[PDB]
């Protein structure tokens, strides 16, 4: 099977919960040594400990991905712990609906968090992936990068930039043996709150979801494993939308 | 004919030369009073003076569109001179090919110059547009916003952000009576290699872009918003 990550070393950011946590655990089961990072150090550590107790190799670190010193520390930690970097999953991000008249600090922060952080981490990881014989970068984007709605000036525009960055930097790092792809997830039921996801909003989301259920973090992690494995060795510059056939407003 | 800009007041940024200059002069000939701005004071004044000599209404002023005090000065100059704002053409921008390992300040500057500037100018103009009964915003983007190539990490990604900003803020400002569109222009004369994949077999003129700009800012486009119109002879140059 080509769907393994044998001898890989994967950095997974923002991974104390949700999609990032599922990606970290799945990648470790598939053979990768995993560097789990999160804004809360205790949460990254809990994921890494669970991986180790299940028979895998992992460490957990605090990382504010918007801080250059934190970014450099994560790169160094991966090299100090496992000797190389071959996979980078840029899952850290955030934001959401905001009014058109938002303060410019809010608009700029969407870009610092969703885009500048993962571009810089990609810059820092790429020389190490080339030295290791090749690698894969995976960006977790959002369906907002392709869809259009109210209150999306910062969130939608920053995620659109993530999508197009993915397509373009594939040309820059392909000759170094590095693939770059993105996943745009639909609405995920994992870690969603029952008060935020009460049956009337769930019914309204499922009305435009052909497959009749909301997503799970493991769905995204399965697609992430595919895109970071030799099974996707000739796939680069792609944005894969995982959303059950539809959209969830 | 609703292809005119009668009684309009249009701010046009980056208008000292090329597309911006053509849009300013075209918009004035179509009936608009034009606030011509450029990073270079002399470039903006020269175009505004040439418009006035040809019989139009125009003022020119320096504006670094990445400087908040400059942005506010342009809004105030439009209101002081002409009493309202109904059209904003965001043509100021820049950048180009850069290596993947560029300094981070280069990457961030692409977004400050190409995106943050025109979002903030859109925020500043919109309440005045709403009070005037409606308006049109036009963003001059780039074909790099939808194309994929080497050395495009900052330029391509920032122009893609401009395109998607256009699509999304159309939802926010439509209820204020404001349309928002973009143009992605092809290579303009200011050869057989650049034209090898251009169906119409010629380079563009600045006037080609200005004609499309005039349409999209005119009542003839009163029900068009959120669109990115590519004006490039059917293909990609170079």
| Angle between helices A18-29 and A217-228 in degrees, nearest 10 | 50
The tokens for B220 are 């003839």
Out of A114, A154, A155, A221, the active site residue is A155
CA distances from A4 to A7, A227, A232, B116, B235 (A): 9, 11, 11, 42, 41
Per the DSSP assignment, residues forming a β-bridge with B136 are B87, B179
- Minimum distance, in Å, between the CA of residue B29 and any CA atom of chain A: 33
d(CA A156, CA B164): 7
Residue A142 in contact with residue A155, Cβ under 8 Å?
A: yes
Q: What is the DSSP letter of B143?
A: G
d(CA B39, CA B191): 30
Half-sphere exposure of B4 (CA within 13 A, CB side): 6
CA distances from B201 to A132, B120, B185, B205 (A): 47, 38, 15, 13
Residue ranges and CATH numbers for the domains of chain A are 9-241 (3.40.50.720)
- Strands (E) in B23-159, as ranges, are 33-38, 58-62, 87-90, 135-140
d(CA B134, CA A3): 55
d(CA B128, CA B74): 13
d(CA A176, CA A164): 20
CB pair distance less than 8 Å for A104 and B116: yes
End-to-end alpha carbon distance in chain B: 37
d(CA A41, CA A61): 6
Nearest CA among B27, B29, B30 for reference residue B10: B27
The reply, when asked if residue A91 is annotated as ligand binding, is: yes
CB pair distance less than 8 Å for A153 and B160: no
Chains A, B: CB pairs < 8 Å: 104
A-chain residues near B118 (CB < 8 A): none
Indicate left, alpha or beta for A7 from its phi (over 0: left) and psi (-120 to 50: alpha): left
- Minimum distance, in Å, between the CA of residue B1 and any CA atom of chain A: 32
d(CA B12, CA A22): 49
Q: Is residue A120 within 8 angstroms of chain B, CB to CB?
A: yes
- Give chain B's largest Cα–Cα span: 52
d(CA B233, CA B196): 12
Strand order in the sheet with A33-38: A58-62, A33-38, A9-12, A87-90, A135-140, A178-185, A239-242
CB pair distance less than 8 Å for B172 and A156: no
User: For this structure, is A154 an active site residue?
Assistant: no
The reply, when asked if residue A125 is annotated as ligand binding, is: no
Q: What is the 3-state secondary structure (H, E, C) of chain A?
A: CCCCCCCCEEEECCCCCHHHHHHHHHHHHCCCEEEEEECCHHHHHHHHHHHHHCCCCEEEEECCCCCHHHHHHHHHHHHHHHCCCCEEEECCCCCCCCCCCCCHHHHHHHHHHHHHHHHHHHHHHHHHHHHCCCEEEEEECCHHHCCCCCCCHHHHHHHHHHHHHHHHHHHHHHHHCEEEEEEEECCECCCCCCCCCCHHHHHHHHCCCCCCCCECHHHHHHHHHHHHCHHHCCCCCCEEEECCCCCCC
Q: Is residue B83 within 8 angstroms of chain A, CB to CB?
A: no
Q: How many CB atoms lie within 10 A of CB A6?
A: 9
> Residues 158-177, chain B: which have Cβ within 8 Å of A?
158, 160-161, 163-165, 167-173
Residue A220 in contact with residue A23, Cβ under 8 Å?
A: yes
d(CA A134, CA A129): 5
Q: Is residue B103 within 8 angstroms of chain A, CB to CB?
A: no
Q: Is residue A150 within 8 angstroms of chain B, CB to CB?
A: yes
- Minimum distance, in Å, between the CA of residue A159 and any CA atom of chain B: 8
Residue A194 phi, psi (nearest 5): -65, -30
Q: Measure CB to CB from residue A107 to each of B100, B119, B226 and give the nearest one.
A: B119
Task: Report CA dihedral (B142, B148, B150, B151) to the nearest 10 degrees.
Answer: 30
The tokens for B161 are 């952000």
d(CA A227, CA B61): 52
Q: Is residue A29 within 8 angstroms of chain B, CB to CB?
A: no
CB pair distance less than 8 Å for B168 and A156: yes
The reply, when asked if residue B162 is annotated as ligand binding, is: no
The tokens for B112 are 């400050």
Q: Is residue A207 within 8 angstroms of chain B, CB to CB?
A: no
Nearest CA among B169, B157, B21, B176 for reference residue B89: B21
Q: Is B86 helix (H, G, I), strand (E, B) or coil?
A: coil
Residue B123 in contact with residue B80, Cβ under 8 Å?
A: no
B-chain residues near A173 (CB < 8 A): 100
The tokens for B167 are 């699509």
């Amino acid at each position: 099977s080509p769907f393994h990550l044998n001898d890989a070393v994967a950095i997974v950011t923002g991974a104390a919960a949700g999609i990032g946590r599922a990606i970290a655990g799945t990648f470790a089961k598939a053979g990768a040594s995993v560097v789990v990072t999160d804004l809360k150090s205790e949460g990254a550590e809990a994921v890494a400990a669970a991986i180790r107790q299940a028979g895998g190799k992992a460490i957990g670190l605090e990382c504010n991905v918007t801080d250059e010193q934190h970014r450099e520390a994560v790169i160094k930690a991966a090299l100090d712990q496992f000797g190389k970097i071959t996979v980078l999953v840029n899952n850290a991000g955030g934001g959401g609906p905001k009014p058109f008249d938002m303060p410019m600090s809010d608009f700029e922060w969407a870009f610092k968090l969703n885009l500048f952080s993962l571009f810089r981490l990609s810059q820092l990881a790429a020389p190490h992936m080339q030295k290791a014989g090749g690698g894969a970068i995976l960006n977790i984007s959002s369906m907002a990068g392709e869809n259009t709605n109210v209150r999306m000036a910062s969130y939608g525009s920053s995620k659109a930039a993530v999508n197009h960055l993915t397509r373009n930097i594939a040309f820059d790092v392909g000759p170094m043996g590095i693939r770059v792809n993105a996943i745009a997830p639909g609405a995920i039921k994992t870690d969603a709150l029952a008060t935020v996801l009460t049956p009337e909003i769930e019914r309204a989301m499922l009305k435009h979801t052909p497959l009749g259920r909301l997503g799970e973090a493991q769905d995204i992690a399965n697609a992430a494993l595919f895109l970071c494995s030799p099974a996707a060795a000739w796939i680069s510059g792609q944005v894969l939308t995982v959303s059950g056939g539809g959209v969830q407003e």
